[PDB]
Every structure is written in structure tokens, then in C-alpha cells.
């Protein structure tokens, strides 16, 4: 089950995860290298990111470095799958080993869609410091993510 | 309209005479609901002579819901039973994973439940989303009758 469950999610095969969980499986089960389904999860599949929620799924566990699966989807900007983390109340303002939030990636990375619904519809703190005293505008200012910038002083 | 008003309010005769033209069976109304979905429970002539004109039994409405959700989620067997002389699916899902027997379960209906563990195809041990089978539910609200029932037929 652990295994499976991490294995068909980490592939993104919705139709083997429902296969899986049809058994009395632990969702927060820790594969071999100690990371649950939805940690290895692929992204890009918010189904099986809501079927393992649905069954329990705890959003906010970190992996080796500090990096729960709502950073990921922030840092990759994965819209959909961050949204359905944040229905199931997974924490928006998680922080990374240096102090970053989901925000700050997203800005750092310039995923302007992704950084629009977290100063928007969530809690995020938008004037959150990293340890460094960076703030995700800061970030996206020194990456050059004019357009995330401009948005991020229009509305915060 | 007149095929769907006429099984929405129960009038048997109008219907059959409509059905006697080679009325479209299928045809949906300005609500996209088929005269089987706007079909008042309780009336399985109406049901039955649909049917067997060619109505699509398996169709979801816009909550889910396929017209054996329905009919066993409100305790009428009659119409269950149709349905799936007709080739319903029995493990047609919900838009929660719960299947007809499910429903009946959850509600303490009885004689759906005996007749789904009894004489049906239906998945037993099947789990929704929240990774209940239809014994689980009927402990969860407390449907002890039902939960009796189904261990004394092997659905426990």
C-alpha cells in the first residue's frame, strides 16, 4: 500500500492510486525514502492531490529540506494543485529551511497567475521577511519579474 | 416537455400514449433534464415503459446524480430494481464515490439495502472518497438494522 500509493502517485497515474485506495490504506504512509504519496506526488494532477486529501492526506509535512508540497507547486506554479492543498486547509505561510513561503518562490520564479491568488484570495503574508530579510517582492524584484512586481505593489 | 411533465407529475397514460408516437425518449427540456431525471419517484410503469423505449439510464444531473442514486438514496426499490433491468449500473458513483448501496445504507433503507446485497452486482466492499464502504456509512449514522443485515450477508 505505502509504497504503491507513493509509486502511482509520483507517476501521476490517477486510475492505479483509485485502484490503491480501495484497500485500508495509511495515505500518510512514508515510501522507502521516507516522503508520502503526496509529497512525491507529480504534479500537474490535482485529482489524485484531492483523492489522497480526501482520505486524509497531511498537506503540511517537509521533506529533507524544509519543502512541503505547496512550495513545490508555488515554486513550479502549479495553480490548480496549490489550490486544492489550500481547500484542504494546508498552511500558506509554511516556511522553507531559509524563511520563504510558498509566496516567495512563486514571485521568485515569476509565476504571476500563482502569485496573484495567493495575494488575493489567501492568507499569504505578503511583507514576510525570509531569514536573509527578504520579502517575495524583494525576490521578484531581484530576478527580474517586472510584471510580478507591478502586481504585487498594485494590490499589497 | 410533454414526454417530461408528464413522468415529472406521474401520468402514466399520457406518457404511453406519447411513448405510442416514437416520441424522442431522450430529448432534455430547457433544464437539460430528461423526462426519466424529472420523473417522479414512486412510479415504476413510468420508469419501466422509459426505459424500454430507449431512455438512458446511467445519465448524471448536474449534482451527480444518476436517477438510482436517487431512487435508493430515498428508499424506492421499485424503481432500483427497473433501472437495472434495464442495465443501470449498479456501481455507478456519486459524485462523492458512493454508490446506490451507499446511500441506502446511510439513509436505513432496508429493503434497498437486502435487495442490492442479495440480487445485484454491486461492489460490497467498495469505498468512497472518504474511504467508506456502504457498512461504514450505515455505523457512521447509525443504521444498525442495516449494519446487521449486511454481515448476516457476507457485505460486512
Given at each position: ?13 490517477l ?8 484497500n485500508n490504506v ?22 489524485i ?6 482520505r ?5 509535512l ?15 506554479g ?14 500558506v505561510?509554511?516556511?522553507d ?24 484570495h ?12 527578504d520579502?517575495?517582492?524583494d ?6 519579474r ?10 499589497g
Amino acid at each position: 500500500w505505502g509504497n504503491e500509493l507513493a509509486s502511482a502517485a509520483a507517476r501521476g497515474d490517477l486510475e492505479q492510486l483509485t485502484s490503491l485506495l480501495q484497500n485500508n490504506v495509511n495515505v500518510n504512509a512514508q515510501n522507502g525514502f521516507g516522503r508520502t504519496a503526496l509529497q512525491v506526488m507529480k504534479l500537474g494532477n490535482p485529482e489524485i492531490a484531492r483523492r489522497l486529501l480526501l482520505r486524509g492526506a497531511n498537506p503540511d509535512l517537509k521533506d529533507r529540506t524544509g519543502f512541503a508540497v505547496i512550495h513545490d507547486a508555488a515554486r513550479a506554479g502549479f495553480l490548480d494543485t496549490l489550490q486544492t492543498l489550500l481547500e484542504f486547509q494546508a498552511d500558506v505561510n509554511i516556511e522553507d529551511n531559509e524563511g520563504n513561503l510558498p509566496l516567495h518562490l512563486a514571485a521568485k520564479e515569476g509565476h504571476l497567475r500563482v502569485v496573484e491568488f495567493l495575494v488575493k484570495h489567501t492568507a499569504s503574508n505578503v511583507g514576510h521577511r525570509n531569514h536573509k530579510g527578504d520579502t517575495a517582492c524583494d525576490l521578484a524584484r531581484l530576478y527580474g519579474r517586472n510584471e510580478v512586481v507591478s502586481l504585487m505593489q498594485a494590490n499589497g
